[PDB]
Amino acid sequence: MNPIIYTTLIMTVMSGTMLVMISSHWLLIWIGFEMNLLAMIPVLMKNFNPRATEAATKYFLTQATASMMLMMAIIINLLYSGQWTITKMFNPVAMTMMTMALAMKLGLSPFHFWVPEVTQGISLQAGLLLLTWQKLAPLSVLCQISQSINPNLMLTMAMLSILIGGWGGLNQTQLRKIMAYSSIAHMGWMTAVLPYNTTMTILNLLIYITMTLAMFMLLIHSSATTTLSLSHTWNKMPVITSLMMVTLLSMGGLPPLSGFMPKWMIIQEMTKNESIIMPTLMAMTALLNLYFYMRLAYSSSLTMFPSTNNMKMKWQFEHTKQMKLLPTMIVLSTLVLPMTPALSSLN
């Protein structure tokens, strides 16, 4: 792909997301989603191979179905109230269809099956984009229509997302699938607090995006897509593996790391309403994500796996391309908890 064409496609993806984020007309939000999908499809197939084509086809089918449900919900809302502005969604059936479509777009359970497949089928950069930037628009719409949500459906999908993310990630040796299941669980966490506080949703999304960016940049720096290929990195650059282990611990939600801040806050928020059982179950379930993060940390940083002879050659060369935002991303992923009250700046 031409660099100019690639830049144009990336800018068109971001332009679709911004159009979704800055519009007051349902038609313009739908157009933003359409433009985002149209520009995103070629980006997933930048490196051409059958797996990339399969991932692109599955993603296109899922997103086109979701967009058609979106437009139908918009039309039903228009029929029962001649309004185009994104507001309290005057019709309940239209709101159910809107919630289902946005959940399908985000990959919330049970519309989660496409996420691991698409993440595994594309390159690490495309997976980074898909798992970080592609969550903003549906979550923005959900935040805008949060007052009219049905808490039962949203909370059911969030709990299912957390459970399925943990259970599915328990069984993976491929790093991209592990990231996809972690993403599903974190979307569940983000959407569980949405009916109660959107500021907590934004905080959780920001921290998740920072941690995911750090993880994906560390995975690109050490060219590993499987557990065994990541187990070789200690013999080439141990600092990367140590930073990766601390990032994994932060993603597991352990204090005093910053990944503890979102869940903590969400729990507190959910305790300001009555809602006692659900946060307890949610933490019990997040222990599974922590378990397989710990297994990755065992495999890559806390023990030394056998290496190969040709690795000696790799000792003589340095990393050519250099990611400028990696150290800041790691520091924000780890040492941010003491600055917790600054979340007031989000609302």
């Binding site: 903590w264 729990i267 305790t271 307890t280 933490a283």
Partner: peptide, 15 residues
């Protein structure tokens, strides 16, 4: 952790 995560909930509840 299985012992301490419920405590956290209780703590915030008390607050």
């Amino acid at each position: 952790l299985a012992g301490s995560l419920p405590l956290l909930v209780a703590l915030v509840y008390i607050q």
